[PDB]
Amino acid sequence: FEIKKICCIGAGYVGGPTCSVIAHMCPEIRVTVVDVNESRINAWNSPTLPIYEPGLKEVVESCRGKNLFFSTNIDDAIKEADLVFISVNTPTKTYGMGKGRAADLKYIEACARRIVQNSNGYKIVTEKSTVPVRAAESIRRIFDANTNLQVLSNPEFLAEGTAIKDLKNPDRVLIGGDETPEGQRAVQALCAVYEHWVPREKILTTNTWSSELSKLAANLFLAQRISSINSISALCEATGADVEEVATAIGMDQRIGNKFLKASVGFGGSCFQKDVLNLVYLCEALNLPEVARYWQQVIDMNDYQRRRFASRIIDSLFNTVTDKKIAILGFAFKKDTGDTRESSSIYISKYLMDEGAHLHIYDPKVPREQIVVDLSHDQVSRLVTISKDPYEACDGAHAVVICTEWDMFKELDYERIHKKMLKPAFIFDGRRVLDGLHNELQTIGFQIETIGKK
Amino acid sequence: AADLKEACARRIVTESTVPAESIRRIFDAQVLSNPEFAIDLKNPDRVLIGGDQRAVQALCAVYEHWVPREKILTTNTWSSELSKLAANLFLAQRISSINSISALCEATGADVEEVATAIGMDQRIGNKFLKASVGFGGSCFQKDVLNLVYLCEALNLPEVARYWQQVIDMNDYQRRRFASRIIDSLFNTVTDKKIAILGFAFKKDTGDTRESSSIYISKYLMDEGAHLHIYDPKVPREQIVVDLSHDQVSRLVTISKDPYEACDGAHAVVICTEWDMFKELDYERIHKKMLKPAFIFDGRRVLDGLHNELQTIGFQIETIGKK
Amino acid sequence: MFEIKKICCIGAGYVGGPTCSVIAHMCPEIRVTVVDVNESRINAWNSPTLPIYEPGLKEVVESCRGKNLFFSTNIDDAIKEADLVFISVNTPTKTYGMGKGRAADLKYIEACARRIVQNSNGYKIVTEKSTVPVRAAESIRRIFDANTKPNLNLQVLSNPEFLAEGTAIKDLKNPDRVLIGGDETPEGQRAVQALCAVYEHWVPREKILTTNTWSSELSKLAANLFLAQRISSINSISALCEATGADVEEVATAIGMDQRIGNKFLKASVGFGGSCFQKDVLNLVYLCEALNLPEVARYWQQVIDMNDYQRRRFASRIIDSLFNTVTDKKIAILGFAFKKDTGDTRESSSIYISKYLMDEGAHLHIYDPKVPREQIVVDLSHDQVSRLVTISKDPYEACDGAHAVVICTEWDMFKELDYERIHKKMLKPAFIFDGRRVLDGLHNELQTIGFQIETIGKKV
């Protein structure tokens, strides 16, 4: 049967865009996006959405109330839907066994049990959340216990900031399901939904475990690249080579690809580190410590890169930063989003705060309450100010610290900035956005240090 | 670490894969970089040339006969020497990463071929050098990782040193757990059992055996006392003897002239090189003449699909990245 | 040519105050102005009760306070009037962030340099007496080269100090040597020579060494290294003595008679204290980890670890002889200063021994002849103090009913106590743990009296 009603438990960075794009593409399907956070739902029904995603505002306003809905009423959405997406979060457990390593599956378990408490007849439950391998066996055991529901895997590959383009023109779609009769009917049903706008060559079908594991493996390879090119940047700094030339060189070899080779202060975002940690913690239970400590190097290098960079700043400021004003330009974890999950800016700020530095922080899309929240747990009242515009942040600053590649940081007037900074002045370029702009800054008198230059 | 023993350099008074500023001091008391990346010579992805200036352009002038200036990259010399290494790093690291994934698959019922397929369709990742195996071989890869590791130990960059050292370690793990897998399947002992080793080259379509995983699987099985019968189409007999020597070799190694005679009375067939001729073998013939139960360890994913036939023929088959 | 006639010293502490009082005493024709932010301190200098205890200091200060020696909170005006500016502030170990517990906190220095280049014009010599990491001057030079003014020409020197507390006045008046470092340029050597001219009034010329800034800074550290290494080395031997039957004092004598080794700083102890020895080693250990010298770092780290071991060994001997329980047991701590003839407590082994016994729930009664009472209370805090710490007005009150007497500071008076009397009112068995060897030779008398006496480097 053709899927006519779709429910998505979890209206976050996945459930919101992914269902907006399903509705814009499939006008004969009813897509209700639900969530327990009533303020989140209400924001999804607002002129100011709860997440900044380019193109997302257009897409939502094009369907909300035609076939795109956002509701707090979790039950009826499931009861009447033909397909329930699970797109809830799977953080790293902060407690109990595996604290700091294992993924917390309590929010998935919550969906699985509310689905069966609120549904009759035939429905397709799809796991889009990034789970461990064989987690779809767990939903199956639940459904075969409190007894007709099928369980599928359809991970997402959207990266935040480019989520709309990536959802309209995906490299591939991954659908994993049972190798049974009942399962292969449910898979080709989900294919039908995607086939409205994804070509069939770019829809990949496998079994449940191979799918759950492909998502982790892909994120490992991606994260590994960054760390790999990040490690080269420290190599460059010690041999006077240049990480951008080396990266450009590496990337011309077609078998390597030219993507994901931009050195940086450190990868951030909701998923990479938690997924790597997840896979490592998987490996211990499976008695696979080599695989475990192999991928663990992807995290160690990231942590190194951030620390090395944080120390770069303190060392250069004549080894002390207590009571010194420093500007942090960029708090989002990447450009063109307002998500600050695991942003390297948190980790540099927290390092600089431990030295007693007074921070002035600016970011175009990140709301101030998030920064205050991210930097706390007061120490924040004393040391952290949040600036309305950048020139305010650098007024009387000893140093300018760029942690996010917002294109506008080139556009700044460093003549003006230099006139009002304490002397001597420094710029610490954590994203290489200022390449080529050096000689200017050098003549202006700024001392410019960046990732991958001696 | 790099055996730089220079002998090329001083004789002169462009490059090899090196860690050139030593040249400019010998010469101080025309030095560019131009490393290599088979018959690849004809349509190179890119031609690397590094210096400090018309000399880069003389060497651009020579390549330009068949490579367009778009595909020719000039840089400083340090960045040229580094770029050669880091490429091989990223390449070798892809292989070790996918090898690590295979172990994961074997323990969870995923297929490394399905997982690699899904991985590589991410254009950012790219789908080259993602075919799991028993271990990467060849002159440059392991040499180049170690070389860079030493270079890091001597620049006080141990975080970096030990990060890339995992590319070697995981390759070592992939080779030993395969060997360990052969031995465990044959009831924990392999002493005096004939085992057929199929394929001694490091990749297919070469005679090159340098650092071939076949060397290390064979040596592992030699430490147990297995009777190895080795056959490889192009690798010369005497190179096998030399590669396993340093007597242990004479007591345990037969170099067979064809695969069917090396598989006769064997407990296991261990495929280490991806020669296509191994796919086309009469495996129903092999199995009648092998001891029972017969085994096939496919360290190259060359028997994919044929499993049902082989399994029904009565063969017991184990392959990388699929239980 | 150029003569220093006005000296400002930012920092009125154990260095700034004595070094300037001596300078002023020997040079009637130079105006020495010692400034500090701490108004309660400055005011104590202008009082008859000086803020620190140094034998002879009260004499030297009173000799020229109001004539050519002054103490003022007016940090701004002294800078602007001075021909020479001493930076003499503290460089503690960072208690936070990167290098916590290792690296030196340069914030106070950096504060001086910016306040100097703000409040100053014309020609001044900026001199770094505080103990800094190698190259720390170079940071001051850069601060001056970016915040420059018309006709401002601030010169930067290294003039490290070697006085020991408890001998500061004697050391400042006949120092083994003076160390001055400056850039090997025209401008620097001018300023180097102008600082020599000052010291030349009372110090022999040959004893005035001139080097570059680095060499100067590093020398101060290395000397402090070599010094502490001797203590930790003899303390190491003392351990081997209690295990073998040797006697550290006998061994120390035999060692120091070799003139290549020399016979000073071989007096084994519960462990070295004072503000500089531990931090200066750690500072250098930290400095090596940035210089990619891991072998040198761990070489010097041993000085600190041996001293931490000498202390904890002693604390454990006490606790073991009280059968590993000390709860509510009275114990007398004689000596809280880090050496005799001083009020200073910074890093005094007495603190650490008191902390080890407070973790056992003992009732400590502490007596010191010079350390002020609230200092001890501060030093033992961060109430555990309320329940466990009494501060004694005299040693006999401190030993009244005690299980043990722990001598930590070699105050000459402890050796003269009425130990017959102490013993009568102690609980038996009645221990004396001598952490300073001040009671050697009284072992026979103390033993017939009934005391259980133990000491560093003597076998039990």
Ligand SMILES: NC(=O)C1=CN([C@@H]2O[C@H](COP(=O)(O)OP(=O)(O)OC[C@H]3O[C@@H](n4cnc5c(N)ncnc54)[C@H](O)[C@@H]3O)[C@@H](O)[C@H]2O)C=CC1
């Ligand atoms: N952010 C990204 O780029 C991508 C993330 N993923 C994965 O997709 C998942 C979704 O992550 P995000 O959307 O970024 O996180 P999120 O925190 O923004 O979304 C989770 C939402 O689900 C709601 N929720 C949780 N449990 C619920 C329950 N029992 N009932 C109803 N609502 C519930 C929460 O209130 C929250 O608003 C994660 O597992 C992530 O690893 C996969 C691909 C891309």
Ligand SMILES: NC(=O)C1=CN([C@@H]2O[C@H](COP(=O)(O)OP(=O)(O)OC[C@H]3O[C@@H](n4cnc5c(N)ncnc54)[C@H](O)[C@@H]3O)[C@@H](O)[C@H]2O)C=CC1
């Ligand atoms: N005490 C000793 O035996 C010797 C120490 N040194 C070195 O000399 C330095 C001075 O140490 P001490 O005098 O013993 O320490 P201290 O703590 O007694 O003296 C420092 C004084 O400077 C004041 N101060 C700090 N920053 C200031 C500022 N910006 N403006 C004005 N006043 C400020 C403080 O309030 C304090 O009164 C240390 O770095 C030490 O390593 C060198 C030789 C001997």
Ligand SMILES: O=c1ccn([C@@H]2O[C@H](COP(=O)(O)OP(=O)(O)O[C@H]3O[C@H](CO)[C@@H](O)[C@H](O)[C@H]3O)[C@@H](O)[C@H]2O)c(=O)[nH]1
């Ligand atoms: O060359 C690069 C590329 C990325 N980054 C950093 O990597 C982090 C994450 O970037 P990105 O990959 O876009 O993060 P996400 O937006 O979370 O997307 C990733 O994680 C998602 C959730 O697992 C997957 O859906 C996507 O495929 C995957 O790209 C950011 O902080 C970037 O600054 C670099 O430093 N250098």
Ligand SMILES: O=c1ccn([C@@H]2O[C@H](COP(=O)(O)OP(=O)(O)O[C@H]3O[C@H](CO)[C@@H](O)[C@H](O)[C@H]3O)[C@@H](O)[C@H]2O)c(=O)[nH]1
């Ligand atoms: O998907 C793959 C691809 C290769 N391999 C194995 O890994 C090795 C790769 O060898 P190969 O790449 O052919 O080695 P070389 O022929 O020495 O050349 C490589 O190393 C050179 C030196 O670093 C570079 O110039 C080349 O671009 C690079 O392909 C072989 O043993 C293969 O069997 C796999 O296991 N999976």
Ligand SMILES: O=c1ccn([C@@H]2O[C@H](COP(=O)(O)OP(=O)(O)O[C@H]3O[C@H](CO)[C@@H](O)[C@H](O)[C@H]3O)[C@@H](O)[C@H]2O)c(=O)[nH]1
């Ligand atoms: O043989 C000895 C000598 C000293 N100490 C102890 O070691 C510590 C240090 O003693 P001392 O050297 O007098 O301390 P300071 O008074 O701080 O002076 C030292 O530290 C100063 C600051 O760096 C330097 O200027 C001096 O040269 C150097 O002697 C004290 O707690 C002593 O009890 C011993 O245990 N055994």
